Amino acid sequence: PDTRP
Amino acid sequence: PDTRP
Amino acid sequence: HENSTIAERLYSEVRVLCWIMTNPSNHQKKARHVKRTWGKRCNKLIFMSSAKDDELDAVALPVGEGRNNLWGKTKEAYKYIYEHHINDADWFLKADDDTYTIVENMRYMLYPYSPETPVYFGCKFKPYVKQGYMSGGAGYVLSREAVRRFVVEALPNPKLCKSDNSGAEDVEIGKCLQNVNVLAGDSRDSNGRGRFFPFVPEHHLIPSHTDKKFWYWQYIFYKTDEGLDCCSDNAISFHYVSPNQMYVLDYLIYHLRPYGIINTPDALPNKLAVGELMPEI
Amino acid sequence: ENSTIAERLYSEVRVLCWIMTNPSNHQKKARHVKRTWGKRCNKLIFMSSAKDDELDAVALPVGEGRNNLWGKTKEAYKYIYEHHINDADWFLKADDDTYTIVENMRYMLYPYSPETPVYFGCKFKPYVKQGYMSGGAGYVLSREAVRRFVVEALPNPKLCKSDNSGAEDVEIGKCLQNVNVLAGDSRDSNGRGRFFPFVPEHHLIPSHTDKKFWYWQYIFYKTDEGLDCCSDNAISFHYVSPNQMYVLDYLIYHLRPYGIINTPDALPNKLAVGELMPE
Ligand SMILES: O=c1ccn([C@@H]2O[C@H](COP(=O)(O)OP(=O)(O)O)[C@@H](O)[C@H]2O)c(=O)[nH]1
Ligand SMILES: O=c1ccn([C@@H]2O[C@H](COP(=O)(O)OP(=O)(O)O)[C@@H](O)[C@H]2O)c(=O)[nH]1
Ligand SMILES: *[C@H]1O[C@H](CO)[C@H](O)[C@H](O)[C@H]1NC(C)=O
Ligand SMILES: *[C@H]1O[C@H](CO)[C@H](O)[C@H](O)[C@H]1NC(C)=O
Ligand SMILES: [Mn+2]
Ligand SMILES: [Mn+2]
């Protein structure tokens, strides 16, 4: 997963 | 006048 | 760990009473967070409102709400303080509920000055008052003798001191105080860097507005370009600080340090005689 | 003012800092890392896809895009091993929106042998048994960790992902676990964090109390955060804007409350090769 804002 | 940021 | 012996000694030698202008809408949103951060470092903290409040122990001034009554709250607050607290402190700070004050740096600046010297300090502006006035947001601090003259000599004379409750709070007190021979002190450090600031640190470190007729560059009494040079290592106040940012400033100023870089305090100047200010920068 | 202790650690704990950036960020972001915290490192290197006079940027043989960041990490540690392995004891990876108090990093690293295979950062639990370190918060490898990575993991596609795609920080976490590099614990002796993937406000005042937020699931060591979150010797914050680099610099290094003198905790004793701190 993409855990950027 | 007011003097804001 | 920290050794705070020096600042505990100044705590007792330089008593600062801090009053905070607020209103019922701000009691929980803003005023609370002043009390929980920098407020508790003052010798005496007072919230000056139009309504009472258990949490703040707020004083209800006989003054309505709105921007049109800020001058009336200032007058009533200094009257109340003279009535009840004039011997409770040496120095009397007015701040907003979006002002952030490093109280230890205020005691540092005020140490040499006699509380019997008629003087107040802040961020000095040029217009409307010959000797300048102090930004209401940046906070300004009056000597005991300055509070006496204000309440005893200026308020009872309508020619010296505006009797309606309307107007710019900080311009009006600037006029009353010039009219009773209170001096507009110079709050800059010995290198000429500012200590009292009407904006957040970013806005002084990185001035975005570029001398383009913006009011600040026209109002400032002492000319400066600001930038990374703007700001004293012993700066006293910033303003338009959000409730959350009160806690961040507290953390970065009081808690976070680079290991092995020990702030060594500059020596305290010698006490001044009544009526005397420090050598001009 | 008295910086004797920090000058002594400067020479005893050499830290090389490399910054992941790209040409679009050279002037907007990377410059401001160099002008603030970057110059406090023993050695500062900008790792890009193109050269730059001002930064003295290294051009890695790697395309741009978020799907080549793992390729830039591999090529950067290769370059650093090739050219700088005996120029420092510790090798920090950071982004161009990371802010590092380098003196606090030296404080944390002092006791550890550079010959101990270990790295430190903000530890997350998913995808790697022993955990991995937040790319944004920054993570720092021992000399011995960098040697194993470049000499033992990179050549072996079974140990270390050979495509240039994936989460840079997860991938290095995997390569390092596979060559017996330890995931150190970077918390202070009171259990407060030192490496932070967000700005200070976000850790001091946790807004996403919304516990579904990925951070509360990823964090390796349990914490509430709040006004308690953060060490007096915190090392890094992230999602720091270029302007905020100068503010943190001012508030940390310059502004102080008169007559409150920070007194340093005594340095722990040096550890044996292979040894970590207790607790
Ligand atoms: O109707 C009002 C508006 C403002 N204030 C107070 O007056 C000061 C000025 O308000 P604010 O900080 O919002 O504006 P600024 O004048 O700094 O732009 C603050 O202490 C406010 O809490 C008030 O008591 N009643
Ligand atoms: O196409 C890209 C996008 C990002 N980056 C770099 O990758 C890191 C992570 O990106 P950013 O800080 O923008 O986002 P984050 O991943 O921290 O949410 C930074 O060091 C950027 O300079 C890059 O080299 N090329
Ligand atoms: C700006 O100036 C006005 C008067 O023109 C008021 O004195 C106002 O309080 C000032 N603002 C600040 C932040 O000091
Ligand atoms: C969040 O997690 C992803 C993988 O799920 C990546 O490791 C990403 O870099 C993480 N973000 C931060 C800020 O550490
Ligand atoms: Mn205000
Ligand atoms: Mn980033």
Numbering used by the authors:
A (entry chain F), B (entry chain G): 2 to 6
C (entry chain B): 86 to 366
D (entry chain A): 87 to 365
Question: What did the publication describing this PDB structure actually write?
Answer:
C1GalT1 is an essential inverting glycosyltransferase responsible for synthesizing the core 1 structure, a common precursor for mucin-type O-glycans found in many glycoproteins. While the addition of α-GalNAc is controlled by twenty different GalNAc-Ts, the elongation of the α-GalNAc (Tn antigen) in all cells is typically determined by a Golgi follow-up inverting galactosyltransferase, termed C1GalT1 or core 1/T-synthase (CAZy31). This GT synthetizes the core 1 disaccharide, also called T antigen (Galβ1-3GalNAc-α-1-O-Thr/Ser). In particular, our data show that C1GalT1 is a GT-A fold dimer that follows the typical SN2 mechanism for inverting GTs with an Asp residue as the catalytic base.
To provide atomic insights into the structure of DmC1GalT1 and its interaction with UDP-Gal/UDP and glycopeptides, we worked with a truncated version of DmC1GalT1 (residues S73-Q388) that was secreted from High Five (Hi5) cells. Crystals of the DmC1GalT1 in the presence of UDP-MnCl2 and APDT*RP were obtained in the space group P21. The asymmetric unit (AU) of P21 crystals contained two molecules of DmC1GalT1 that were arranged as a homodimer with each monomer adopting the typical GT-A fold. The PISA server further confirmed this dimeric structure and revealed that the dimer presented a large buried surface area (7621 Å2), implying a very stable and tight interface. The uridine moiety of UDP establishes a CH–π interaction with Leu155 while the uracil moiety is tethered via hydrogen bonds to Glu150 and Lys158 side chains and Gly151 backbone. The ribose moiety of uridine interacts with the Asp182 side chain and Met160 backbone, and the pyrophosphate interacts with Arg152, His324 and Tyr325 side chains. The pyrophosphate group oxygen atoms, Asp181 and Asp183 of the DxD motif and His324 hexagonally coordinate Mn2+. The glycopeptide GalNAc moiety is recognized through hydrogen bonds formed between the acetamide carbonyl and Ser220 side chain, OH3 with Asp255 side chain, OH4 with Asp255/Tyr218 side chains, and OH6 with Tyr304 side chain. At the peptide level, the Pro2 side chain and the methyl group of Thr4 establish CH–π interactions with Tyr213, and Trp300/Tyr304, respectively, and the Thr4 backbone makes a hydrogen bond with Trp300 side chain. Our structural studies also show the striking finding that the enzyme imposes a non-natural staggered conformation to α-GalNAc-Thr linkage that is typically found in α-GalNAc-Ser.
